[PDB]
Enzyme design. Sequence first.
Site, short mmCIF file in Angstrom:
data_model
loop_
_atom_site.label_atom_id
_atom_site.label_comp_id
_atom_site.label_asym_id
_atom_site.label_seq_id
_atom_site.Cartn_x
_atom_site.Cartn_y
_atom_site.Cartn_z
CG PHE A 166 -8.48 4.70 5.82
CD1 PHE A 166 -9.06 4.46 4.59
CD2 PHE A 166 -9.10 4.20 6.96
CE1 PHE A 166 -10.26 3.76 4.49
CE2 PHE A 166 -10.30 3.49 6.87
CZ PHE A 166 -10.87 3.27 5.63
CG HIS B 38 -0.35 -5.89 5.59
ND1 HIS B 38 -0.44 -5.16 6.76
CD2 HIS B 38 -1.49 -5.66 4.91
CE1 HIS B 38 -1.59 -4.51 6.78
NE2 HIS B 38 -2.25 -4.80 5.67
CD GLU C 158 -4.72 -2.27 9.81
OE1 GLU C 158 -5.81 -1.97 9.29
OE2 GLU C 158 -3.93 -3.11 9.32
CG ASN D 127 -5.90 -4.52 12.45
OD1 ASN D 127 -5.07 -4.23 13.32
ND2 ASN D 127 -5.55 -4.92 11.23
CD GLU E 99 -7.31 -6.60 8.79
OE1 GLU E 99 -7.72 -6.80 7.63
OE2 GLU E 99 -7.56 -5.56 9.43
CE1 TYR F 50 -9.58 0.88 9.75
CE2 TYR F 50 -9.28 -1.47 10.12
CZ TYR F 50 -8.78 -0.24 9.73
OH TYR F 50 -7.47 -0.11 9.33
CD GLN G 287 -2.81 -1.13 2.41
OE1 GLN G 287 -2.49 -1.71 3.44
NE2 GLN G 287 -3.94 -0.44 2.28
NE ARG H 28 0.50 -3.95 11.91
CZ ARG H 28 -0.61 -4.21 11.22
NH1 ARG H 28 -1.57 -3.30 11.12
NH2 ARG H 28 -0.76 -5.40 10.64
N1 LIG Z 1 -9.14 -3.63 4.59
C1 LIG Z 1 -9.09 -4.57 5.51
C2 LIG Z 1 -9.95 -5.84 5.37
C3 LIG Z 1 -10.23 -6.31 3.94
C4 LIG Z 1 -11.31 -7.40 4.02
S1 LIG Z 1 -11.93 -8.05 2.42
C5 LIG Z 1 -13.20 -6.79 1.99
C6 LIG Z 1 -12.55 -5.49 1.48
C7 LIG Z 1 -12.81 -4.48 2.61
O1 LIG Z 1 -12.12 -3.49 2.85
N2 LIG Z 1 -13.95 -4.92 3.31
C8 LIG Z 1 -14.34 -4.27 4.58
C9 LIG Z 1 -13.33 -4.21 5.74
C10 LIG Z 1 -12.47 -3.12 5.87
C11 LIG Z 1 -11.58 -3.04 6.93
C12 LIG Z 1 -11.54 -4.05 7.88
C13 LIG Z 1 -12.41 -5.13 7.77
C14 LIG Z 1 -13.30 -5.21 6.71
C15 LIG Z 1 -14.02 -6.33 3.22
O2 LIG Z 1 -14.67 -7.06 3.96
N3 LIG Z 1 -8.36 -4.45 6.60
C16 LIG Z 1 -7.49 -3.33 6.92
O3 LIG Z 1 -8.18 -2.12 6.56
C17 LIG Z 1 -7.40 -0.97 6.19
C18 LIG Z 1 -8.36 0.03 5.59
O4 LIG Z 1 -9.00 -0.76 4.58
C19 LIG Z 1 -9.93 0.00 3.82
O5 LIG Z 1 -11.23 -0.10 4.43
C20 LIG Z 1 -12.28 0.49 3.62
C21 LIG Z 1 -12.33 -0.14 2.22
O6 LIG Z 1 -13.36 0.47 1.45
C22 LIG Z 1 -10.96 0.00 1.55
O7 LIG Z 1 -10.94 -0.63 0.26
C23 LIG Z 1 -9.93 -0.67 2.44
O8 LIG Z 1 -8.63 -0.60 1.85
C24 LIG Z 1 -6.39 -1.43 5.15
O9 LIG Z 1 -5.75 -0.30 4.54
C25 LIG Z 1 -5.38 -2.32 5.85
O10 LIG Z 1 -4.30 -2.67 4.98
C26 LIG Z 1 -6.10 -3.60 6.29
O11 LIG Z 1 -5.27 -4.30 7.23
#
Ligand SMILES: N=C(CCCS[C@@H]1CC(=O)N(Cc2ccccc2)C1=O)N[C@@H]1O[C@H](CO[C@@H]2OC[C@@H](O)[C@H](O)[C@H]2O)[C@@H](O)[C@H](O)[C@H]1O
Length: 475
Positions: free
Chosen positions: A448, A126, A385, A312, A172, A314, A22, A80
Site C-alpha cells: 500500500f 491501533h 487513511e 478512513n 477503526e 478505501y 505494521q 500519522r
Molecule cells: N485493514 C483495515 C480494516 C480491517 C477490517 S477486518 C477485515 C480485514 C480487511 O482488511 N478487510 C477489509 C477492509 C480493509 C480496509 C478497510 C476496511 C475493510 C476486513 O473487513 N483498515 C485499515 O486498512 C489498511 C489497509 O488494510 C489492508 O486492506 C486490504 C487487506 O487485504 C489487507 O489485509 C489490509 O491490511 C491497514 O493497513 C490499516 O492498518 C487499517 O487501519
Amino acid sequence: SSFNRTSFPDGFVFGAASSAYQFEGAAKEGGKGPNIWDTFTHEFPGKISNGSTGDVADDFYHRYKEDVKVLKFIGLDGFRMSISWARVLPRGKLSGGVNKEGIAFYNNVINDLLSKGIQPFITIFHWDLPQALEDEYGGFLSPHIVNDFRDFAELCFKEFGDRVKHWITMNEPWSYSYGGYDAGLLAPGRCSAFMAFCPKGNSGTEPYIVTHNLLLSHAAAVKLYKEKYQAYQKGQIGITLVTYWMIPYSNSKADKDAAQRALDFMYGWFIEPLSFGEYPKSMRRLVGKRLPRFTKEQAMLVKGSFDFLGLNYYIANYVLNVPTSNSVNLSYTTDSLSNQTAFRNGVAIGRPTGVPAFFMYPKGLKDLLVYTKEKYNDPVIYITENGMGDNNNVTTEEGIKDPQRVYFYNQHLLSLKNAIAAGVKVKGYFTWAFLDNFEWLSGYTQRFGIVYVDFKDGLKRYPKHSALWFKKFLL
Ligand SMILES: N=C(CCCS[C@@H]1CC(=O)N(Cc2ccccc2)C1=O)N[C@@H]1O[C@H](CO[C@@H]2OC[C@@H](O)[C@H](O)[C@H]2O)[C@@H](O)[C@H](O)[C@H]1O
Ligand SMILES: *[C@@H]1O[C@H](CO[C@@H]2O[C@@H](C)[C@@H](O)[C@@H](O)[C@@H]2O)[C@@H](O[C@@H]2O[C@H](CO)[C@@H](O[C@@H]3O[C@H](CO)[C@@H](O)[C@H](O)[C@@H]3O)[C@H](O)[C@H]2NC(C)=O)[C@H](O)[C@H]1NC(C)=O
Ligand SMILES: *[C@@H]1O[C@H](CO)[C@@H](O[C@@H]2O[C@H](CO)[C@@H](O)[C@H](O)[C@H]2NC(C)=O)[C@H](O)[C@H]1NC(C)=O
C-alpha cells in the site's frame, strides 16, 4: 503545470500514515512486552498470508531517522503514526510500570519529525493491545479496559503532549470489533464455534460487547484530555472511523433500505453514539437485547466526545437486501440483512487494484463526506487513511512504477477537492501507506506504500512514482 496543493485550503495538512505493529518491528526488543498481534501471528500462522509476522516488519524502530528523511524528501506536512501500548507499558497497566526505553523511542521519532517541520498525528491505539490486559480480563470484552485505556492515554498526554497537538484515541473500532470478534480474522481471533475458525467466541454477542467498551474507552480518554490537558497543551483530540460507501444495488426500496442498514451497522454503530449518544434505530430493532444500552452517564460521556473526526476511506460497495430466513447463523455480519458486492450487472464498480475486493470509486469519498456533514452537524474532518494495494508478485523495479496509484491519488484528491467545495470542513489528508508494510491478515503480500520496501533485500526503501507525484504536488 499540474494539479497541486494550492487547490486546497491554506494550511491544509498533507501527510502519510503508519501504525506501530505494521511498521516498527523490534517486537521483543527495547523492553517491549507482548501484544495480541504478537500472539495472534505466532499462534495462528494459517490466518496470515505466507505465515508472516510483524516481528521485524519495516524495522521502523531502528530505521526511523532514515525514514523521517524520506518524509521530508516527499515534503509532507504531517505524519500519522501510533503508539505501541505494550512498548511503553509492557504489563498494560500503569502500575505495571513505564518502559523508559519505549518512551525514548517515541520522543526520538517526534523530535526528528518536528525538526523536518512535520506535525505528528498520533493514534493512541491501533489494535495492538498488551497481552497482559487480554489475559487479565479479556481486553475489550471487559469494562476494566476503560481505566487502563485512560491511563495509557494519560501517559501519552504527559510524555508527548507538549509537542503532539493532534491526538486520535483509536483507529477503526469497527475493524477491531468485527475482525477480532465476528469473523475472527484479526487478533484476538474470536468467533462462533459454528464457523469452525476460532477456538473461542460468539459472533452474535461479543462484537456488540466490545464496541461498547471501545466507545467508553475512547470517551474516557477524550474527557481526560479536555478537562486536564487541552487548555494548557492547546491540542485537539478525535477518533478515526472507517466505512465503505454503500450504494443500493437497485432502485428498489428493499435495496435502498439494505444499503442504509449496511451503513448503519458499519458507520452508524460508532458515529451515532458519538453524535447523538445512542445506537442507530436499525441496530436497536434488528439486534434487540444483544445490543447494549447506554446508561445516562455513558451517553453523556460518549456524545460529543471529539474535536475532529478521522475518516478512513478505501472503497464503495453495492448492497443487496437479504430476506429473512430460517437458517440459524447468528452474527453481527448477518444481523443487518444486507449483502455487499463490488459488481452490478456483471460490471465492477471501478478500476481494479491488487486487492481482490477493492476497486476504485473516488466519487464515494465525496459522497461519504457530504453525508457526514449533513447528518452530523458539519464536523471538522481529517482523512486519516486513503490508498490502494498492489499484489506483491513482481520485481522491485516493476513495483516502484505505480501509475495506477498515481491515478488513484489524482482522482481521490480531485474528489476531496469537490467535497471541500461543497462545504465539508476537511483539514487534512493522509496516504495509507507511507511504506509497504505488514498488512495484517495479508502479511507482506499487499503493498500500500507510496514508498517501496524491498523485503527480500535489506528492507531497502525506494520512493514510488506516487511518492514523486506527491512531492511535485506539494511544491
Ligand atoms: N485493514 C483495515 C480494516 C480491517 C477490517 S477486518 C477485515 C480485514 C480487511 O482488511 N478487510 C477489509 C477492509 C480493509 C480496509 C478497510 C476496511 C475493510 C476486513 O473487513 N483498515 C485499515 O486498512 C489498511 C489497509 O488494510 C489492508 O486492506 C486490504 C487487506 O487485504 C489487507 O489485509 C489490509 O491490511 C491497514 O493497513 C490499516 O492498518 C487499517 O487501519
Ligand atoms: C497549480 O495548480 C493550478 C490549478 O490547476 C488547475 O486546477 C486543478 C484542480 C487541476 O484540474 C489542474 O489540471 C488545473 O490546471 C495551476 O493554475 C492553472 O494553470 C492552468 C494551466 O495549466 C490554467 O489554465 C489555462 O489558463 C490559460 C489562461 O491563463 C488559458 O489560456 C488555458 O487555455 C488554460 O485554460 C488555469 O487557469 C490555472 N488556474 C489558476 C487558478 O491559476 C498552477 O499552474 C499550478 N502550479 C504549478 C506550479 O504547477
Ligand atoms: C500479479 O498480481 C496482479 C493482481 O492480482 C495480477 O493482475 C490481475 O490479474 C487478474 C487475473 O487475470 C485480473 O483479473 C486482474 O484484473 C489483475 N489486476 C490488476 C492488473 O491490477 C497479475 O496478473 C499478477 N502477475 C503475476 C505474474 O502473477
